[PDB]
Design a protein around this ligand. Structure first.
Ligand SMILES: [Ca+2]
Ligand SMILES: [Ca+2]
Ligand SMILES: [Ca+2]
Ligand SMILES: [Ca+2]
Ligand SMILES: [Ca+2]
Ligand SMILES: [Zn+2]
Lengths: 52, 314, 98, 52, 101
């Protein structure tokens, strides 16, 4: 097999911007979890409507 | 659990290396390169093996260890990685991250290289061995993996920080991402339960660097023996009534305020990269975006919980 | 820590220059004990540990470096008697009092 | 290279001191650490009129 | 001393050295093809020219110990070989220069 030298090469700023994009990724997963939590809130509350 | 700091099992800057060139309390060997700031346990060269171990054996039933460190790799893929060890003997040299195999204790392994080919790495693996388990590096040790969390830890802006907590026979890992300057931004990734360790053992650190080159560096290593709060005894009458303590503190508080005032007009009395400031601003921007939305998690969760009580009450 | 070991105001004058450079030859021993607390709290926690105090006593100001176990004996003894909250740390409540 | 240091890890014809870190491919004369000073000099004095 | 001729003819040392890159072992080699192998494979730089640095590695190896020879001894080994084998005085050795000895 082997390894290319492109993985070795990196500019100063692109590494920073990629780290920023990784910092965006955690907040995307955050968004997913919040959406899931609010959706199950909808599901329980609109049937607590029926129960009450 | 009340903590007790163990300087006898710790090291830290800004004076980490004594004038004779050695770490107190800690024997470095192999490719471990200790500086007065940090230790280059394994430099960015091929096949680098370093390891720094406690000179004294540790006997703590419950304890916690905080490690501040940095793995830097010019390439995206890193080799080999790092290993924290609570092994009964001092495994200074061997194949497993620069440390010996067949250890009696536990090893926490930061493998950037995916030898298994399963796209796990960079990842963190808990493996406890009695001294009879041979660590197979080829599958990234996936078979004997007690637990694992797949997280990237290379090339972070801020030093990655790890909390390793053995308490009530469970070993829990908290991790700061190194994407924030916060020290205490610790996150769960993995833990093991009913964990058995030798009560007497040596703490140690080791790091290896394969054909791919990584700088494994440790800025600080902190050790805290954990005692249970019901077992820590609150012995009174040693506070000297605690009123003299209150009488003493505000003197030093006023003195540190006036010390700030004294230090003020001499940095300017006798006198940061633009962009690095701006990248820092963007980094903290992402940070408090995450903080605001985590506060939003807690707000929405407590709204949920309050609903599950007032709906029931209605 | 003997008191006169802390009471070397000309040595802490060799610590404090540039940080502050006004000469004050009326420095009381308690006024400079807290100096010794301040200039050796490198961590900024205002909470002295044995590591910082090791640098306080070892210094870099030649003199032979003391043996490890003797260095243990003083640092274990000072840790034993000086502080009372069992913190692993020497404080204003603990340092200037003892 | 590809074997710049010998079996003892030393460089032939060159003596190193300070923070110079010789490897089989290269020498890390000064690593990325604060206040690093390294140097590698010829063991033998060279007496050449013109050279490259 | 220079490079001894019998040291070229160490056939097993060639299978010691050709191991890893070539997976067909054949033990019938005349001194011709193995010295072609030795000259090429010890031209690590790929320039088909040997210098005193490549030669010194070819003398030493790590055949895993043995005590290391003196550096000035190896200087005379390189200088003795260069005085006896490199004809064009390039600071390098041709295979044609190599095939002289
Ligand atoms: Ca893996
Ligand atoms: Ca302190
Ligand atoms: Ca105390
Ligand atoms: Ca060549
Ligand atoms: Ca030639
Ligand atoms: Zn050979």
């Amino acid at each position: 097999q082997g390894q290319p030298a492109e993985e070795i090469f990196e500019s100063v700023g692109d590494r920073e911007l990629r780290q920023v994009f990784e910092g965006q990724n955690r907040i995307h997963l955050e968004i997913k979890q919040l959406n899931r939590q609010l959706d199950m809130i909808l599901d329980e509350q609109r049937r607590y409507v029926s129960s009450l | 659990p009340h903590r007790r700091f163990e300087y006898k099992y710790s090291f830290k800057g800004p004076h980490l290396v004594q004038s004779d060139g050695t770490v107190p309390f800690w024997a470095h060997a192999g490719n471990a390169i200790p500086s007065s700031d940090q230790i280059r346990v394994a430099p960015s060269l091929k096949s680098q093996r370093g390891s720094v171990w406690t000179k004294t054996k540790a006997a703590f039933e419950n304890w916690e260890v905080e490690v501040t460190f940095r793995v830097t790799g010019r390439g995206r893929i890193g080799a080999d990685g790092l290993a924290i060890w609570y092994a009964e003997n001092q495994g200074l040299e061997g194949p497993v991250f620069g440390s010996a195999d067949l250890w009696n204790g536990v090893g926490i392994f930061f493998d950037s290289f995916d030898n298994d080919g399963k796209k796990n790495n960079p990842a963190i693996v808990i493996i406890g061995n009695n001294g009879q388990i041979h660590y197979d590096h080829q599958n990234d040790g996936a078979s004997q993996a007690l637990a694992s969390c797949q997280r990237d830890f290379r090339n972070k802006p801020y030093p990655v920080r790890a909390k390793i907590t053995y308490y009530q026979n469970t070993l829990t890992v908290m991790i700061n991402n190194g994407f924030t300057p916060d020290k205490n931004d610790y996150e769960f990734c993995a833990k093991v339960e009913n964990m058995i360790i030798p009560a007497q053992g040596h703490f140690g650190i080791s790091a290896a660097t394969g054909g791919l080159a990584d700088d494994h560096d440790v800025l600080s290593f902190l050790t805290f023996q954990l005692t249970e709060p019901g077992k820590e005894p609150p012995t009174p009458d040693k506070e000297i009534s605690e009123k003299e303590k209150e009488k003493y503190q505000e003197e030093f508080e006023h003195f540190q305020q006036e010390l700030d005032k004294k230090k003020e007009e001499f940095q300017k009395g006798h006198p940061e990269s633009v962009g690095d400031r701006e990248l820092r601003q963007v980094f903290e921007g992402q940070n408090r975006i995450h903080l605001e939305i985590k506060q939003l998690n807690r707000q929405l969760d407590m709204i949920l919980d309050e609903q599950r009580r007032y709906v029931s009450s209605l | 820590l003997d008191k006169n070991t802390v009471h070397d105001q000309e040595h802490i004058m060799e610590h404090l220059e540039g940080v502050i450079n006004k000469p004050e030859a009326e420095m009381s021993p308690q006024e400079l004990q807290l100096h010794y607390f301040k200039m050796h709290d490198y961590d900024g926690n205002n909470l002295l540990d044995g590591l910082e105090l090791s640098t306080a006593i070892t210094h870099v100001h030649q003199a032979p470096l003391m043996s490890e176990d003797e260095l243990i004996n003083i640092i274990d003894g000072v840790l034993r008697d000086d502080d009372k909250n069992n913190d692993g740390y020497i404080d204003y409540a603990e340092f200037a009092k003892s």
